[PDB]
């Protein structure tokens, strides 16, 4: 039958123009007062998935 998307991965990765995936950085949900503004500011923009993790992401997202 059709392969099923891992819906949880679809909620956290989006495919970019050349075929990588963008994601939201960890560590910006809570416990925020003790973190420096510089650290938080650098966590705000989305990042790309690393080379070692691309395989796991692609496995989870066959219809991406």
């Amino acid at each position: 039958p059709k392969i099923k998307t891992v819906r949880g991965a679809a909620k956290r990765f989006k495919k970019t123009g050349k075929g990588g995936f963008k994601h939201k950085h960890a560590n910006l949900r809570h416990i925020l007062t003790k973190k420096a503004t510089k650290r938080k500011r650098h966590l705000r923009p989305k990042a790309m998935v690393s080379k070692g993790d691309l395989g796991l992401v692609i496995a989870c997202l066959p219809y991406a």
């Binding site: 909620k11 956290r12 994601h23 939201k24 992401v57 496995a59």
Partner: protein, 96 residues
């Protein structure tokens, strides 16, 4: 996605965003699509009749992609700045 029991990547990262219903009913039109319609007037209905946009599309935007070489009248669509320049230079007009 299993990683041996370590919190896997797709769960140690956070979810983001929401999915927009209005994006599903909006389409983009290339300049090369303009000559493909029947009659020289480009609107939602004529694009649907020519199979350029889906039957349930409610909004469309013409973008600068490809070329237009014939005069066309665009009615009821949004047009980018570059596409508007190309259409008018080819001799057409844009009506809101």
């Amino acid at each position: 996605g299993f990683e041996g029991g370590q919190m896997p990547l797709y769960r140690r990262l956070p979810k983001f965003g929401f999915t927009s219903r209005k994006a599903a009913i909006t389409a983009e039109i290339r300049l090369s699509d303009l000559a493909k319609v029947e009659g020289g007037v480009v609107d939602l209905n004529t694009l649907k009749a020519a199979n350029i946009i889906g039957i349930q599309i409610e909004f469309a935007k013409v973008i600068l992609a490809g070329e237009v070489t014939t005069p066309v009248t665009v009615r009821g669509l949004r047009v980018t700045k570059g596409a508007r320049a190309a259409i008018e230079a080819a001799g057409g007009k844009i009506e809101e």
